[PDB]
Amino acid sequence: GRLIYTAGGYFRQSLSYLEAYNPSDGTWLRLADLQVPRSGLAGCVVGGLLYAVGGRNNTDSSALDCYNPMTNQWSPCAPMSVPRNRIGVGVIDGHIYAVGGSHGCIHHNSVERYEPERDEWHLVAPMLTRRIGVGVAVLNRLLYAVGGFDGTNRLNSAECYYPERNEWRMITAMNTIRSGAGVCVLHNCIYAAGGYDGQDQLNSVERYDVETETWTFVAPMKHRRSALGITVHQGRIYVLGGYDGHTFLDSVECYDPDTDTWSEVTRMTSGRSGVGVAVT
Numbered sequence: 283g284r285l286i287y288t289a290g291g292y293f294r295q296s297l298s299y300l301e302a303y304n305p306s307d308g309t310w311l312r313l314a315d316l317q318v319p320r321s322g323l324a325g326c327v328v329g330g331l332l333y334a335v336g337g338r339n340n341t342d343s344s345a346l347d348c349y350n351p352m353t354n355q356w357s358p359c360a361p362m363s364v365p366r367n368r369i370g371v372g373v374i375d376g377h378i379y380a381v382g383g384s385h386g387c388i389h390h391n392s393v394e395r396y397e398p399e400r401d402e403w404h405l406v407a408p409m410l411t412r413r414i415g416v417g418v419a420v421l422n423r424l425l426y427a428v429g430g431f432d433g434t435n436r437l438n439s440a441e442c443y444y445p446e447r448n449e450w451r452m453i454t455a456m457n458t459i460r461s462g463a464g465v466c467v468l469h470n471c472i473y474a475a476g477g478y479d480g481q482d483q484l485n486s487v488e489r490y491d492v493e494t495e496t497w498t499f500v501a502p503m504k505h506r507r508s509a510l511g512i513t514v515h516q517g518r519i520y521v522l523g524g525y526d527g528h529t530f531l532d533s534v535e536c537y538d539p540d541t542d543t544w545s546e547v548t549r550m551t552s553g554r555s556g557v558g559v560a561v562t
């Protein structure tokens with residue numbers, strides 16, 4: 283079936299593991315290592331290929347790498363215009379948007395679009411706010427950028443990028459300050475799980491309802507975590523690993539909306555934070 287893929291991460295050092303999880307049977311698979319270990323990166327899928335974007339290696343990375351699940355092989359792509367650690371990523375119409383992130387102490391508000399048909403990156407309109415450790419979600423061909431750190435403030439704001447118009451507009455702020463949160467879209471809402479509010483790692487979780495332009499809380503996860511991996515598979519949310527203030531988790535929790543519950547459904551081969559994640 284489809285698999286949940288987790289690339290890179292951090293446990294004492296930057297990692298190059300690429301493992302895949304099969305929710306239809308609880309199995310883990312070991313795939314080809316990343317050529318350079320990275321954490322703080324994001325994953326996404328376009329046309330069957332997995333992409334590892336940005337992060338920080340063993341200095342901050344502008345790398346974009348493609349993984350073919352059919353050949354079990356990694357291949358370099360065109361690099362981004364700038365290094366982007368703690369990057370968020372979305373896909374619109376087969377094009378990868380790289381949002382925010384950091385290069386040393388520069389906190390990006392810039393955004394660039396990658397086209398796989400050309401192996402080219404191009405800058406689009408910059409966000410209204412600099413954000414590293416920013417969650418990114420794509421709903422209704424709109425790209426949403428949620429939380430993060432702007433270099434001075436941890437943020438609870440969120441903005442919205444309009445591709446046809448090439449512009450950003452703020453939207454309603456979350457109830458909670460969140461950097462390094464997990465953000466995805468499940469059943470036409472934006473979900474923001476976990477994060478770091480400035481003093482603690484969070485386990486709260488709020489979804490945004492576009493119509494009501496409201497953020498409302500939902501059942502919190504069992505393990506407070508930041509810098510977690512997140513994805514959606516067969517109508518549920520999966521959060522993977524992360525840091526809870528003391529430990530690098532190996533926990534994988536699964537949110538079911540209909541029942542509004544978080545189950546623990548497996549554990550990673552080892553505990554880690556700062557993984558990129560995708561499903562294909």
Ligand SMILES: CCN1CCN(CC(=O)Nc2ccc(S(=O)(=O)N(CC(N)=O)c3ccc(N(CC(N)=O)S(=O)(=O)c4ccc(OC)cc4)c4ccccc34)cc2)CC1
Nearest residue numbers: 292321322338368414415431461462478508509525555556
């Ligand atoms: C310098 C002194 N010191 C401090 C800590 N320490 C132990 C340690 O370092 N743990 C540790 C914890 C995570 C990693 S990581 O996942 O790999 N990584 C760096 C990467 N790119 O690899 C990242 C760090 C911080 C982030 N956040 C946003 C943001 N802008 O900071 S955050 O989640 O909100 C946060 C977490 C923790 C926190 O402290 C509680 C505050 C905010 C990230 C967000 C998204 C993706 C990666 C992030 C690596 C080591 C050793 C030494």
